[PDB]
RNA sequence: GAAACAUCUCAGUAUCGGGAGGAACAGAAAACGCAACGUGAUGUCGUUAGUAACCGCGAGUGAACGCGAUACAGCCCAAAC
RNA sequence: GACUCGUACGGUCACUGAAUCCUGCCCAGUGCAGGUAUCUGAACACCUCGUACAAGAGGACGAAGGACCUGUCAACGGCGG
RNA sequence: AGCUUUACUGCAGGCUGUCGCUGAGGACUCUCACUCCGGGAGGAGGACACCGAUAGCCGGGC
């Protein structure tokens, strides 16, 4: 039979309808008054969190992060530039807001490592994402066969090197075939043309 | 100059002389779906758009003759070289 | 007044001093920042790629 | 070119800033839970460096000592009041509603409780005209008819120092001393006296503006100079 | 550079911000598409090829599948119960 | 964030440059501003055509702006045959 | 190279429509988001404004 989780999931397919709609219209009011990064005791979207690796366990942390909506906040050129490079308004960043969120979170918790993140809505001027972080030093995690992998040294600052899930997707690594000639194994090894 | 609306002449399709009717080529309408149309949309961005930033040329003092010759029997038309003519009016 | 020799006479102000962190006489005692190692501005040591030829 | 003077201003550097650290008080109406029972005595009359007009030191019944925007005719010893029931005399502050129409008011609040915004310069005064349960109309010193919340507090009387503008500065030095007490760069060089690079009116073999002086409202900073969105110019007709 | 120059080119180069390791990254197909009764995770090397593709269709720019090699390795959750 | 511990007797933006006698005529062009029946005026949504969808073509509505009208020269300037 | 402009091409900026935030009953009411004033209670404003996106106009300010 359906899991209880499936209901949380099925409700979030349309955050603008039903009870969830009224829930958001309410939460966001408190959210808009919270800070850039807020640690929260429980995931707002349980199905999604667990689906992404979450676990009600010691060393597993979650924090909601809000980032501004829109294009790049860019400064107009202060020296000679050909028309092509004189833009300001339409320039957008190559890293998506969800990735900016994962990074701001990880910096808030210097000892933790980003495991994954998911969207929890947006109002007219900002987006909120809940990031799941892990304490690579807690034995509760060092002894977990499903998460201890994030304890290895080579997983340090994984979010800053785009090893996150949203990182790899944003790096154009989803497709294993056509279209990923300039993305795999890395953007940089491909001359940064991806 | 003046020009007969109809007259006998060679029909390249029938391969035999027949009465043709002369009409001025009316411009067909563009679809905006040709390859060039997609390149304009694709290649236009921030700053100058290269070729797509250029504007219409000018005019020659007199234009050449742009006509269609329709074979009165088979109904098929053919084109011919044109010649400079300040004005062209048909007779009947 | 000439901007040359005559304006050289008022130069008795101390700015750049021996740096507590790198030992170079680049610690601006008024700004409290080392122009050489970045002490007082950066936890990380001051360093730029333009300090050497691009392919080296 | 180079940024024009109007642009250097915004950066808020020393040259353009006001000598705030030399200012006495941020004149604002007192707050009263209600009742109006608040009253105090004028202890002194000081000079206000920020407004070139007198200000009054006042001690209230609850120990609070604060400078106040003094109207004309207030002297040491006098007792002033602040509240809904305050007496209707010069120097007292009460909401427009409790104020009788046709009475000169000063230091009027835009939003009730904001502390006073309108009519606070030397000798000026607002004019309460219409009352209502909803709107209290006041005629500001500019001549405009301002619709206001009757709950907006205001002081009775005209501001002190009236007529300050009647005497001419006579000499640059006097202007200098006044200018030094304000957030203003002075003296003023005419744009037409500058180089093209420095101002849209600069350049030429003789002094005259390049184009016409009336500039569009939409003009960008760096170009909005001269007669801004003038509806007309000159004195004729 | 295009014998000017704006797209293009120089070049995702120089330079800047953040960060890992002894190597990084990638990686067990919602692949390929010599179309098959076929191949079978990923890097890399040789080639495919200056080919296809781009481009004031100017100057210029420029892959991939496959193949021959190197080395090979395959697994764990979420949910159902 | 400056102006601003400021509020039109303010402060901003310009021109002229103490006093004295004065400062004519011109709103066609250009600028600014106000108005505007009508005309013109983009995109979204909407209607028609087209396409089992889509590209695309047309229509209706019409913002600021423009046409048109007015004000204005101590506004740019003009004051002849 | 600096400077100019009704040189060519663009880029900021201002104005304006539209979409999102955004809700209840071609003109209108409301309050619950949102904004602002108030120490608070509460007041004003209010689906507009702000902000994000886009479209047209102006645009040697660059
Ligand atoms: Cl991390
Ligand atoms: Cl013809
Ligand atoms: Cl003054
Ligand atoms: Cl194969
Ligand atoms: K170039
Ligand atoms: Mg363009
Ligand atoms: Mg010098
Ligand atoms: Mg000063
Ligand atoms: Mg104040
Ligand atoms: Mg002057
Ligand atoms: Mg000069
Ligand atoms: Mg200029
Ligand atoms: Mg002169
Ligand atoms: Mg002059
Ligand atoms: Mg060249
Ligand atoms: Mg590599
Ligand atoms: Mg050429
Ligand atoms: Mg290239
Ligand atoms: Mg391929
Ligand atoms: Mg002079
Ligand atoms: Mg030059
Ligand atoms: Mg506030
Ligand atoms: Mg220029
Ligand atoms: Na961290
Ligand atoms: Na790319
Ligand atoms: Na493209
Ligand atoms: Na000039
Ligand atoms: Na050349
Ligand atoms: Na050249
Ligand atoms: Na090109
Ligand atoms: Na005129
Ligand atoms: Na005029
Ligand atoms: Na020069």
UniProtKB/Swiss-Prot annotation, chain B:
Binds 1 zinc ion per subunit. Keywords: Metal-binding, Ribonucleoprotein, Ribosomal protein, RNA-binding, rRNA-binding, tRNA-binding, Zinc, Zinc-finger. The keyword Repressor does not apply. The keyword Ribosomal protein applies. Residues 22-63 are annotated as: Disordered. InterPro entries: Ribosomal_eL44, Ribosomal_LSU_eL42, Ribosomal_zn-bd. A zinc finger (C4-type) spans 11-74. Zn(2+) binds at residues 11, 14, 71, 74. Its cofactor is Zn(2+). One of its GO terms (cellular component) is ribonucleoprotein complex. GO terms for molecular function: large ribosomal subunit rRNA binding; structural constituent of ribosome; tRNA binding; zinc ion binding. GO terms for biological process: translation. SUPFAM superfamilies: Zn-binding ribosomal proteins. Gene3D superfamilies: 3.10.450.80. Binds to the 23S rRNA. Binds deacetylated tRNA in the E site; when the tRNA binds a stretch of 7 amino acids are displaced to allow binding. Belongs to the eukaryotic ribosomal protein eL42 family. Part of the 50S ribosomal subunit. Interacts weakly with protein L15e. Binds the E site tRNA. HAMAP family: Ribosomal_L44e. This is Large ribosomal subunit protein eL42. It comes from Haloarcula marismortui (strain ATCC 43049 / DSM 3752 / JCM 8966 / VKM B-1809).
Swiss-Prot record, chain C:
Binds 1 zinc ion per subunit. Residues 1-16 have a biased composition (Polar residues). InterPro entries: Ribosomal_eL37 (IPR001569), Ribosomal_eL37/eL43 (IPR011331), Ribosomal_eL37_CS (IPR018267), Ribosomal_zn-bd (IPR011332). Its cofactor is Zn(2+). GO terms for molecular function: rRNA binding; structural constituent of ribosome; zinc ion binding. Zn(2+) binds at residues 19, 22, 34, 37. Keywords: Metal-binding, Ribonucleoprotein, Ribosomal protein, RNA-binding, rRNA-binding, Zinc, Zinc-finger. It holds the Pfam family Ribosomal_L37e. The keyword Ribosomal protein applies. Residues 1-25 are annotated as: Disordered. A zinc finger (C4-type) spans 19-37. One of its GO terms (biological process) is translation. GO terms for cellular component: cytosolic large ribosomal subunit. Belongs to the eukaryotic ribosomal protein eL37 family. Binds to the 23S rRNA. PANTHER family: 60S RIBOSOMAL PROTEIN L37 (PTHR10768), RIBOSOMAL PROTEIN L37 (PTHR10768:SF0). HAMAP family: Ribosomal_eL37. Part of the 50S ribosomal subunit. Interacts weakly with protein L4. This is Large ribosomal subunit protein eL37. It comes from Haloarcula marismortui (strain ATCC 43049 / DSM 3752 / JCM 8966 / VKM B-1809). The gene is rpl37e.
From Swiss-Prot, chain D:
SUPFAM superfamilies: Nucleic acid-binding proteins (SSF50249), Translation proteins SH3-like domain (SSF50104). The keyword Transcription regulation does not apply. Residues 199-237 are annotated as: Disordered. HAMAP family: Ribosomal_uL2_A (MF_01320_A). NCBIfam families: PRK09612.1. One of the primary rRNA binding proteins. Required for association of the 30S and 50S subunits to form the 70S ribosome, for tRNA binding and peptide bond formation. It has been suggested to have peptidyltransferase activity; this is somewhat controversial. Makes several contacts with the 16S rRNA in the 70S ribosome. This protein can be partially incorporated into E.coli polysomes in vivo, indicating it can replace the endogenous protein. This is Large ribosomal subunit protein uL2. It comes from Haloarcula marismortui (strain ATCC 43049 / DSM 3752 / JCM 8966 / VKM B-1809) (Halobacterium marismortui). The gene is rpl2.
